[PDB]
Amino acid sequence: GREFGNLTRMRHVISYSLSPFEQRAYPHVFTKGIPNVLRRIRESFFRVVPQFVVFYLIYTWGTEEFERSKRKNPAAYENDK
Template sequence: MHPICSEPTINTAPQRAFPKNYFTKGIPNTWRRFRSQVFRVAPPFVLAYVVYTWGNEEFERLKRKNAADFENDE
């Protein structure tokens, strides 16, 4: 029978929702993967945050009127 048309089978190997070696291997592996990728992923987000906050501060600054422009008004 063609593999695309084959009927689904049930996997006989049991799957664990919470593996036995989660604390001994899983958490350290997650930490290792995080450390290896943080300097590749974080800088664009930091740059985006800096640009976003600068843009909001600049917008608020430009919304205000300059008091020096109105010193000679009565």
């Protein structure tokens, strides 16, 4: 479907809700809110960090490589000529 009333068939489902004016906007934002954010962070931590850690290694290595490439060499006129 494409409009409310003829989208899908459902049965035997009950919902309960409460008015915005009868409940708080920041309930258990520290007892329950902070723990949940931490859970999410750890659940998706080792799936992302390693790739960016690798990127840093190449970045540092390549930058340092370029610096060495422009540093005077002792071989330069090592024959005193």
